[PDB]
Structure formats: C-alpha cells, structure tokens
A paper describes a structure:
The metazoan transcription elongation complex (EC) of RNA polymerase II (RNAPII) generally stalls between the transcription start site and the first (+1) nucleosome. NELF is a large, metazoan-specific protein complex consisting of four subunits, NELF-A, NELF-B, NELF-C/D, and NELF-E. It binds both RNAPII and the nascent RNA transcript emerging from RNAPII and inhibits transcription. DSIF, a conserved heterodimer complex of Suppressor of Ty 4 (SPT4) and SPT5, is required for NELF recruitment and RNAPII pausing and also serves as a processivity factor upon the pause release by NELF dissociation. In the present study, we determined the cryo-EM structures of mammalian ECs containing RNAPII, NELF, DSIF, and/or TFIIS stalled on a nucleosomal DNA.
In some of the NELF-containing classes, RNAPII had advanced to collide with the downstream nucleosome, and we reconstructed the PEC structure containing RNAPII, DSIF, NELF, TFIIS, and the nucleosome (PEC2-nuc). In this structure, NELF binds RNAPII in mode 2, simultaneously with TFIIS. TFIIS binds the rim of the RNAPII secondary channel, in a manner similar to that observed previously. There is no apparent contact or steric clash between TFIIS and NELF. After stripping ~20 bp of the nucleosomal DNA from the histone surfaces, RNAPII is stalled within the downstream nucleosome. The leading edge of RNAPII is positioned around SHL (–5) of the nucleosome, consistent with the previous in vivo observation. In PEC2-nuc, the NELF-E basic helix directly contacts the nucleosomal DNA. In PEC2-nuc, TFIIS is indeed bound to the exposed binding site. Thus, the PEC2-nuc complex formed near the entry of the nucleosome strongly restricts RNAPII progression downstream beyond SHL(–5). Thereby, NELF and the nucleosome seem to cooperatively restrict RNAPII progression beyond SHL(–5) of the nucleosome.
Residue numbers in the entry:
A (entry chain V): 1 to 194
B (entry chain A): 578 to 673
C (entry chain A): 914 to 1058
D (entry chain H): 2 to 150
E (entry chain W): 40 to 582
F (entry chain U): 1 to 132
The structure:
C-alpha cells in the first residue's frame, strides 16, 4: 500500500513504525518530521493554527493539497509533452518517469506514474519489462504503452488477441445457426463495413 | 369635465354616452406620427392620436374612418361582435 | 432565447414568484414536483406547436384569421373584474393548464370517437388550439394578465 | 379628507411641440418639495396661465370635506360645503394608467400616474411613496389655484 | 478512560491520523488513559501518507520538468489562501490566543505576504465581533503594512492627513502643468469627492484661492475639475457652488441657475427670467453663468441634431449664450467697472446662422459648402467653433454617416482644419476628436474608403502637428504605430509628409520624441529610400 | 410629525444618516428636515456622531428657499448650537452657513487657527505666483 517511498529518501509508514517503536517521545519527532522535511514554507506551518482551530483536522487540506498538486503536475506534464522541443520534452519526461518508477508502487501516486508513462511514446525496455510483470500495472497501461508491450511480446499479444477471435467465432456460429430463417436478413445480408 | 370657473362638457365626454355597453378598443388616427410610440409620451399623445376606448368611454383620441368606417376591428365591428345586432343599430342611429 | 424567457415559467426564482402569486401559491409551486412536471410538459407542448407553426406558416407571417379574439376577451375580463394588475393574484397555474386542457375538448368540429374522427377533429381545430395555448399560458397569465 | 395629493408647482414650460389646439395648452410643471414633474392640459381660454406662474395642486378623491362619496352625476343645486369654493380651476377625470420602474424581483421607486379629464390628459410622475392613493379606474378631481404669493 | 480509549483508537483507525492538528492533544489523552502506544503506532503504520513530504517531492518534480518556482509558490499559496477562507473559526481562535497570552510568530509570517494581508482584511470586514481581526489589523499597521489597510474611504474621516495629501497632490499638479495634472487628477479627485464634506471644504478653500484676480484661472479650472468629478458620480452640489460665489445679490438668477443645473435641462421660463435680468440695467457677474455644465447645456440644446427647442425662445437662447460668452466685463476688487458689448450683435447673428445650419439637417452638406464665406467668417468665434466641432462630432459619430459622406477629403475635416488654424485652445479638443475618428474601425464600409479616410485623418494630424500642438500628437502617433491599429503605409505617409513639411532645427524634446518613431522597423524599412534628400536619413544626420 | 424626544431624535438621525459607506448626503434631506427634528437637535446634537453632524450640515443647504424663509429661526438656532461642539468641522461649517439664512450665500473666512487651511492657501498662492 505504502511501498516504494523508501527509495527516494521520503520515509513511508514502514520506517515510521520502525522509528516510533523504539522512540519514547513521539510528539517532538512527529512535529519535526511534519515540519523539518515537510513543506518548507512558513505559509503551511503558519496556516496549521487557523485550520486546526476551525475544527476541521489538518489532514483534510493536507490530502487536498497532495491530490491537487498531483493533478496540476499531471496536467502540466501533459502540456509539456505537447510544448517546446520534442526531444527535450521527451528526455525530461524520461527523467521524470525514471524517478517516478520508484513510487510506481503507490496507488495514490500510481496515476502519476501511469500518466507520465503514457506521455512517453516509447517506454524503455526495462521499465516495460517491470510493469508487464504486474497485473494491474499491465492493465492500466495506455494504448501506446500496450502497443510497445505487444511489439516485442509475441505470445502475450496472441493471448490478448485470442479471446476476441473466440467472440468473433461465437457470434459467427450463432448467426449461422440463427433460428430466424428468412431471405430478408441472413449471414451474408449485412454490409462488410458494419 | 370642468366644474369651475364654469361647467363645461367635452365632445369625448358626450360621445362616450353614445358608445354602447362596455366596449374596449384601441385604434390610431389617420395623421398619427409613426415615431411617437417609440419615444416618450406614448400613453399621453401631444396630438391626441391613439384612440382608446375603455368600458365604453372615449378616454382619448380623435375618431376618423380608421375607427368608425368599414374597417376590420373598427368600433362598429367591435360593437357588432361584443353586443348584439340591435344595440349596434341603436349605436348607428344615435351617432347620426 | 426570447421565446424561452417569455414562455418558460421558471419555478425556481422565489423573489420573482413573490410579486405575482400569494404565499400559499408560491409555496405550492415551489415544493410540489408534480406541478413542476406538468408545467414543463406544457412548455414542451409549446415548443412542439412552435415547430408545427413554422412549417405551416413559412415567410414568418404572424397575421392569421381565427374565430375568437383572445386578447380582447382577456381585456374585457380585466375590466369587468377590476383586476388591478399591481398586486399578486390568486391564480394557481395548474388551474390555468388544466382549464385550457378541458376547454380544448369542448370545442368540437368533428364529433366522434373512432380514430378517424378523432384525427379529423384534431386537425380541424389545430390552429385555434395552438393560438389558445400560446396566449392562455402559465407565465402570461401571471406576468402579463 | 380624501386628499390624494397636494403640492406647489410652477410653470417651467409651455406646449413645446407647438400650439396643436386653439383653446388647450400643454403645461410642463415642476414641483418644489417632493420634486415632482407634471404634464397638464388646461382650458387656456377660461383659465389663462403664463410662464413662471405658481399654483397649488390638490388632487382629491371627493369634493366634500366630510369625506362622503358621490354618485358622479351633475347636481348643481347642492348645498353641502365643497373644496371648490377656495379654488379657481376644477377638473373631474378618471385615472387610466399607472406606470413605474418595476422589475421582475423588486418593487417600483419612481411611479407615473395618468388621468384623463374627459379628454384632457395629465401625467403625474414622481417617487413611489407619494402616489399611493392612485389606483386605476377611479375618479378624481384636480382643484388647482394660482398662487400670486 | 476506557470509553475515551475506544474513541481515540477509532480515531486512529481512520485513514492517515498522523496528519491530525490535535494529534499532540490526542496522544496526550491516550498517554493519560494509560493505553500502550504500540496499538497507535501499529495503526498509523498503515495510516501515514507523506502529504507533507510528497508535496515537496512533486514540487521538485515540477521544477525539474520546467515549472518555474514562482508559479509553484503562487499556486500553493493560492490553494492555502482558499483553504483558510473556507476554514475560519473566530471564538476558538480567540480562546487559543488568550491561552497563548503572547504574539505568535506565525501570524507575522502571514503578515509578510500580500495574499494573507488581503485575506486578513476580508476576515476583519466579515466579522466585527472578533477581537483577533482588529488585533491583526493593528499588528499589520505596526509591521509597516498599514497601506494594505483600507484608506480610500479613511481619508474622508481624517482631517489633517487628507488635507496634507491634497496639498501634495495639488503641488505635484502645479509642478508638471497639464501634462501631470492629467495624471494626478483622477486619484486626487477620487479621494476629495469620495466624501461630501471633504468636497465642500476643498471647494471653499479653492474658491477662496480663486478670489485673487491674478493667477486665478488655473485655480478656477481645478475647482471646476473637482466639481465635474463630483458630478460624474451622480453626486450633485451645484446649489452649494452657487451659494459659495456672489449669487446672493441676484436671488432670481441664483434660482434660475440652480433649477437648470439641478434638472440638467433648460426651461424656457428661467431662460426668459435670465433674459429679463441681464437685458435690464443691472446685469450680474457674467462668471456665474459661465459654469462649464451650464454652457455645455446651452451647446447641447442649441447644436445637437435631433434635439428640438422652442422657436419662440430661440432668439432669447442665442442672446443669452452670446452675452455669456463674448461679453467682457471689467472688475476690480470684486467690484464691476465696465462691460464690453462690442461682440453682441454680430456674435448673435453668427450664432443664429450657425445654429440654423446645425439644426436644419435635411439640407445636404453641399449647401453647407455653398455658404462657405459666411461659414468661415462666423467660425472665427471660439464658442461657435466648439459648437460646430461637437456638431460635426455628433453627426459623424453616427455609424451610417460615413456612407452619406461621399468625399475622399470631406469638408468636415476642412472645417476642423479651420478650427485648428483659428484657435490653439481647441487643439486639445481637435486632437481628441481626431483620435476618436481614427480609432473608430468600421466594418460596414469597404477597406478602400477606410484607407482613404485614414489617409485624410493623417493629413489632419500632420496639420495639427504643424501648428505647434506637437507633443501629444507625436505621442499618440507613436502609440498607434506600436499598437498595430494603424497600417504601415499610413505611418509611412504620416512621417514622410511630416519630415517633408517641417524644417530644422528641431528641439531636444521633438528629437527625443521622434527618434523612437524612426526606430520602429516599419518606418526604417519603408521611408528609408535611395534619394539625395531622404527624410529619415536627414533627420538622423541632424542628430 | 411629533417632537420626538432627545435621545430618540438622535437615534432617528443616526438611523437616517448613519450609513458610513454613504459619505454623501442623501437627496432625501429635502423632506427629512422639518421643524420638529431641527428643534429637538438643540439637545441631542451632543448625541450625534461627527459624521451625523457633517451630513446634517451638508443637507441643510439642499432646501428650497421658501422652506428656508419659513424656517429662519430654527435654522439659525441649529447653526449656532452646532457652533458649540468639540468638532472644529462643525464649528467652521456653522460659521460658513450662518450667512445662508440672511443672504442665501456662503461666508468665506479663512486663516483662523487652522494649520492645514493656512499652509495650503500659502503654498498654493506662492505656487501660482511662480507660474501665473
């Protein structure tokens, strides 16, 4: 649930529990962790008093800030993918994706990684090999990412295609063995286009 | 209509006694300036056009063939449609 | 735009409703949903009649010849009953809607019940019914008469 | 008392569009206290007026100081005291229209009442707080008298 | 304690309780209850998100991708400002501050930024009952940001500060003449006329200044500016203005002027009263009837097409206007000496002829040209010149007038040229009307006639620049050249013909204002041509 | 129109003229000024705020001269009693308006223990003398 945060140096709940298990005073440690390495702005720490005293806990706007900064980052990366020089923006998105595959295991930030990976028209080999090993990560991939997956994975592409062919055969057999027997509508009646 | 300094009746006041029943009609005089309605004084015409009849009373306006002749929606037509034919006959006789 | 803003009879603006209807009527037309649905259906029939008219009468000719003079009848009623069109009125719009609906049935040109006669009767009074609905509206009966 | 309205006016203008009729003149008048404006027709032949003249306008719903109502029929042989004794010029008409600055949401602030004196029209325009006794289809009187001051 | 223990544990069971604002108090209560913190830590292990750290990580990602830190900070601050707007509580804030018993530093951190200053102002205006809001306003004043506190309506309640700021504004107005009055007048008029009492005292002081006959023209002008700015807001004080002057000795004239300026219209009765007063042997001070609004009323009534005036009082209106404008009265120590009536009969005749031309519109412009001798003889009167100026302004202001104006070099602009030649006082007005004419882009005319009209307007601007009204014309032309609202060939023709007609030496001001005009590439690439006498080349060589 | 008592008169005045946002005297002062209110101000003027006094003084001028003629004594009395307050503003306005009931105009006296007035007059006079 909260895996992959440790790679970038931003400790997750696992190391939090590890540190507070052998800690005697949680108050000062939690205050410094939410203050020192937190948002390094006097605005947020100074806003904590008013938002506390309103009765609405600070968790609410903290989560809202996280989600809206996520959305703004995603939309701006989408814009950058369609602004400026193609190679430069693609290299910047490659760097961002390489530094986001550390957090790819975070469902609250999995949309970030997946959208940025969609933003790359050609994902490098190793990251694709990593994502295709997991069911949900494979299934959330964009159309370009799935195209990259199938371009060099014959057996998996065939496995994906096979159920569609099965549905086609089932529909064709049901039409061929249709109870409604008439010349007005038959197997060969519909146009090739439809 | 005018009590002091001396009693005086108006032509419209007397004519309202001729119009039968309670008849409502709005017409326009032949010499009505077409640009008066748009501007101010639409409901108070300086030239006394815009014939208006309410409850069988000639409130304002000057009668001409546009309101007394053989035109659709004229005063005699409204009298015929609203009232009977006998009352309209009395109207025709009384006017003359 | 003008047609909608002149025939819609919005039932959400409470302050506007205050000037036209009494309290016991504005609360009824604001709370009940059956009334709102009926009035919206009335406006839909309004638009359908407009569509029919625009192919019946191309070239945009409004003048038409019809039996009864609705505007003059409304004026006569106003002068008879001393309406004083300044105060709110005790006219529930649903009364207007269902009164028009009932009145339409009473004006018969082709009498019968089989589908042929019903269709002929519907055609023979189509223009008069359209005009009658278009004047005896719910908004016009509350904002203009 | 049945005194709908009472104020002092002065003749700031005469018929601006010209002399349409021989025996009738269109008076444009402004008030002093309520800051009213008035448009009036008078029988200029029997009650001559000039520019700058001042008069007291008293629109009353009845001519009897006691306040009783009248049938509206000419009965010259009447003995009851009347307001007309202290006034020079009297009309008797019927208000036919009341306009205003009404909107779909709030009420009106500036009103305008038109009354027709057997053909001679008159428009009284001002603020909504004064034209309260004016209700459409009601007979009123004019009762104006010149102020020589 | 057990019930409180269950409540605290259920709170801990919620998502991400580590980010609570009272987590210190909750942990204190849990410690007091005697429960082991092991359960709390175990619950928070699955209930911790770095919603304070991952925001920084995504901000670093934004910086690396290309987002400038300024926009990141602005977005974060805007979101926090909105969250503070939605989450304010007065009474618990007051209780917590009373418990603190001191001035917090984080409040000062809020004070450092302008967004929180505006938020604190809005909070203070929202709830008068909270002492914290006045406390924060006072602390903002202490920190030096009392300018953020409202002062547009505060100066009205303040006597000395308002008076001194008025003094400084008027001194700066007189420093730069009109060229700085046009800039220092809006805000000064706003602050003066925001309150009526300050307006009245300003008028009283300024008119007392205007009492002196020497140098009082600028003083009267500034007083009239204040009066007209007050009138623009729908606020009327004309009667007080009349009472400030010498209107006492003439109660009838005071009445007539007050009534007309209160209504804003001209009534024939008061016009006749003024005619009787002035035609009599004891006329009043002519300056009282020279209010800009009153003369503007005369001009509007006597010159506006479509406006009708009584034919039986037309001559009286003309006579009153002529006596107001052309008649000169000698005064000493606020006492009348003599009255000049030289320009009374001919002036009235000229005004009558011009008014007949103005309000008899059905006649074509060709008939107007046919009477050019009388027209040009009568146009030399400055008031009549302004009258024809605004009459042409209102006629050509019609969108359909251009279709009726069938000359590539219309006679109207010739009349404007004559107006500019006759008087220099109208040159600001001529420039303003030319600016309005040129800036009006027409979509119901062919672009060919648009180009012809624009070229003729350029000729008019060249003429205006020739007669000494140069600096505002030059600035406007440069603004149009840089504004892309003028064709390149148009400015080409303008500058080429200007340097064709003007001759050296050129002043430092003109050279300074004209060098950037030739700096633009649209001129450097067009007017610069191979010739022995190149205008741009010769002007550059002259520097 | 009754002689509504002192404190009540002050409350009514601060209800009709208490709008701090409306720093301009309303046009309603034409009808709001009657004999009873002005007479009652003789004692409740101390109960009026400075803004109320200023707006009342401004609105006193917006009256027809028939009303002024028939309210000579009351208007002079209210001017005199407003000329005995702590506010220098009301003192100066009472002195300026004392001439209105007599001549219909306003008095113009200055340079009297008003530092801003004297300094502004002097600086503007010398500035005009610089650039006549």
């Amino acid at each position: 649930m909260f895996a992959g945060l440790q790679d970038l140096g931003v400790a997750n709940g696992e190391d939090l529990k590890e540190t507070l298990t052998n800690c005697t005073e949680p108050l000062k440690a939690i205050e410094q962790f939410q203050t020192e390495n937190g948002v390094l702005l006097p605005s947020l720490q100074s806003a904590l008093p008013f938002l506390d005293l309103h009765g609405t806990p600070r968790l609410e706007f903290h989560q809202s800030v996280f989600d809206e900064l996520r959305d703004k980052l995603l939309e701006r990366v989408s814009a950058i993918a369609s602004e400026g020089k193609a190679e430069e923006r693609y290299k910047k998105l490659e760097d961002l994706l390489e530094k986001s595959f550390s957090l790819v295991k975070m469902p609250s930030l999995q949309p970030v990684v997946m959208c940025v990976m969609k933003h790359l028209p050609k994902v490098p080999e190793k990251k694709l090999k990593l994502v295709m090993a997991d069911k949900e990560l494979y299934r959330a991939c964009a159309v370009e990412v799935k195209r990259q997956i199938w371009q060099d994975n014959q057996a998996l592409f065939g496995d994906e295609v096979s159920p569609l062919l099965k549905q086609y055969i089932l529909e064709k057999e049901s039409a061929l063995f249709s109870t409604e027997l008439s010349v007005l509508h038959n197997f060969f009646s519909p146009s090739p286009k439809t | 209509a005018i009590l002091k300094p001396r009693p005086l009746w108006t032509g419209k006041q007397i004519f309202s006694l001729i119009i039968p029943g309670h008849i409502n009609c709005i017409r326009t005089h032949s010499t009505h300036p077409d640009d008066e309605d748009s501007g101010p004084y639409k409901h108070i015409s300086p030239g006394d056009t815009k014939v208006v009849v309410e409850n069988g009373e000639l409130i304002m306006g000057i009668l001409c063939k546009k309101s007394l002749g053989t035109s659709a929606g004229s005063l005699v037509h409204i009298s015929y449609l609203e009232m009977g034919h006998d009352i309209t006959r009395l109207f025709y006789s009384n006017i003359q | 735009k003008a047609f909608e803003k002149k025939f819609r009879f919005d039932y959400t603006n409470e302050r506007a409703l205050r000037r036209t209807l009494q309290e016991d009527l504005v609360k009824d037309v604001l709370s009940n949903a059956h009334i709102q649905n009926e009035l919206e259906r009335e406006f839909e029939r309004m638009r359908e009649d407009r569509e029919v008219l625009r192919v019946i009468f191309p070239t945009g000719d409004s003048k038409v010849v019809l039996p009864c003079n609705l505007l003059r009848m409304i004026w006569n009623a106003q002068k008879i009953f001393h309406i004083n069109p300044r105060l709110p009125s005790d006219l529930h719009p649903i009364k207007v809607v269902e009164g028009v609906k009932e009145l339409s049935k009473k004006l018969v040109i082709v009498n019968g019940d089989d589908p042929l006669s019903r269709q002929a009767q519907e055609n023979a009074t189509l223009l008069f019914n359209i005009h009658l609905r278009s004047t005896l509206c719910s908004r016009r009966m509350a904002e203009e008469f | 008392a049945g005194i709908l309205f009472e104020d002092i006016f002065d003749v700031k203008d005469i018929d601006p569009e010209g002399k349409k009729f021989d025996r009738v003149s269109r008076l444009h008048c402004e008030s002093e206290s309520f800051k009213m404006d008035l448009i009036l027709d008078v029988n200029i032949q029997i009650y001559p007026v000039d520019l700058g003249d001042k008069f007291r306008l008293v629109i009353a719903s009845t001519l009897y100081e006691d306040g009783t109502l009248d049938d509206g029929e000419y009965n010259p042989t009447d003995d009851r005291p009347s307001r007309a004794d202290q006034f020079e010029y009297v009309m008797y008409g019927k208000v036919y229209r009341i306009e205003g600055d009404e909107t779909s949401t709030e009420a009106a602030t500036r009103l305008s009442a038109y009354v027709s004196y057997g053909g001679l029209l008159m428009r009284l325009q001002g603020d909504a707080n004064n034209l309260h006794g004016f209700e459409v289809d009601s007979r009123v009187y004019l009762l104006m008298k010149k102020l020589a001051f | 304690d057990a019930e409180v223990q269950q409540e605290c544990l259920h709170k801990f069971s919620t998502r991400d309780y580590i980010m609570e604002p009272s987590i210190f108090n909750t942990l204190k209560r849990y410690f007091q209850a005697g429960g082991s913190p092991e359960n709390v830590i175990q619950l928070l292990s699955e209930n911790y998100t770095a919603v304070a750290q991952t925001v920084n990580l995504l901000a670093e990602w934004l910086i690396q991708t290309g987002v400038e830190p300024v926009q990141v900070q602005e977005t974060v601050e805007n979101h926090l400002k909105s969250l503070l707007i939605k989450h304010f509580d007065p009474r618990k804030a007051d209780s917590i501050f009373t418990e603190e018993g001191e001035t917090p530093a984080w409040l000062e951190q809020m004070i450092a930024h302008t967004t929180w200053r505006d938020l604190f102002y809005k909070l203070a205006e929202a709830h008068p009952d909270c002492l914290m809001l006045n406390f924060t306003v006072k602390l903002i004043s202490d920190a030096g940001y009392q300018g953020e506190i409202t002062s547009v309506s505060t100066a009205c309640q303040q006597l000395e500060v308002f008076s001194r700021v008025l003094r400084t504004s008027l001194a700066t107005i007189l420093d730069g003449g009109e060229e700085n009055l046009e800039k220092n007048l809006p805000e000064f008029a706003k602050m003066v006329c925001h309150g009526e009492h300050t307006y009245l005292f300003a008028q009283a002081m300024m008119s007392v200044l205007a009492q002196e006959e020497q140098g009082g023209s600028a003083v009267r002008r500034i007083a009239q500016e204040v009066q007209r700015f007050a009138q623009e807001k729908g606020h009327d004080a004309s009667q007080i203005t009349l009472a400030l002057g010498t209107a006492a000795s003439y109660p009838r004239a005071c009445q007539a002027l007050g009534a007309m300026l209160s209504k804003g219209a001209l009534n024939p009765a008061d016009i006749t009263v003024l005619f009787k007063m002035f035609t009599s042997m004891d006329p009043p001070p002519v300056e009282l009837i020279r209010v800009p609004a009153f003369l503007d009323l005369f001009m509007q009534s006597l010159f506006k097409p479509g406006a009708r005036i009584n034919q039986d009082h037309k001559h009286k209106y003309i006579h009153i206007l002529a006596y107001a404008a052309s008649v000169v009265e000698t005064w000493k120590k606020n006492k009348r000496v003599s009255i000049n009536k030289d320009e009374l009969k001919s002036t009235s005749k000229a005004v009558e002829t011009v008014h007949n031309l103005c309000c008899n519109e059905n006649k074509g412009a060709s008939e107007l040209v046919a009477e050019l001798s009388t027209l040009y003889q009568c146009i030399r009167f400055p008031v009549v010149a302004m009258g024809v100026l605004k009459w042409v302004d209102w006629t050509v202001s019609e969108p359909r007038y251009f279709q009726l104006q069938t000359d590539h070099t219309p006679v109207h602009l010739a009349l404007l040229d004559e107006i500019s030649t006759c008087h220099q006082l109208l040159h600001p007005q001529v420039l303003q009307l030319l600016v309005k004419l040129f800036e009006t882009e027409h979509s119901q005319l062919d672009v060919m006639e648009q180009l012809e009209l624009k070229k003729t307007l350029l000729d008019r601007m060249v003429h205006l620049l020739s007669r000494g009204y140069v600096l505002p014309v030059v600035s406007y032309i440069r603004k149009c050249l840089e504004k892309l609202d003028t064709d390149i060939s148009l400015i080409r023709y303008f500058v080429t013909e200007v340097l064709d007609v003007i001759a050296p030496p050129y002043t430092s001001d003109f050279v300074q204002l004209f060098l950037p005009i030739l700096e633009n590439d649209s001129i450097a690439g067009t007017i610069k041509t191979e010739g022995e006498h190149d205008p741009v080349t010769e002007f550059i060589a002259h520097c | 129109m009754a002689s509504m008592r002192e404190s009540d008169t002050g409350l009514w005045l601060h209800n009709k003229l208490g709008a701090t946002d409306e720093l301009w005297a309303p046009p309603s002062i034409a009808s709001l000024l009657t004999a009873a209110v002005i007479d009652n101000i003789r004692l409740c003027f101390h109960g009026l705020s400075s803004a109320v006094k200023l707006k009342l003084l401004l609105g006193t001028l917006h009256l027809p001269r028939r009303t002024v003629d028939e309210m000579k004594g009351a208007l002079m009395e209210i001017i005199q009693l407003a000329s005995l307050d702590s506010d220098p503003w009301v003192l100066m306005v009472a002195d300026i308006l004392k001439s209105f009931p007599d001549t219909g105009s306003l008095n113009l006296e200055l340079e009297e223990q008003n530092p801003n007035v004297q300094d502004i007059l002097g600086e503007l006079r010398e500035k005009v003398g610089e650039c006549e």
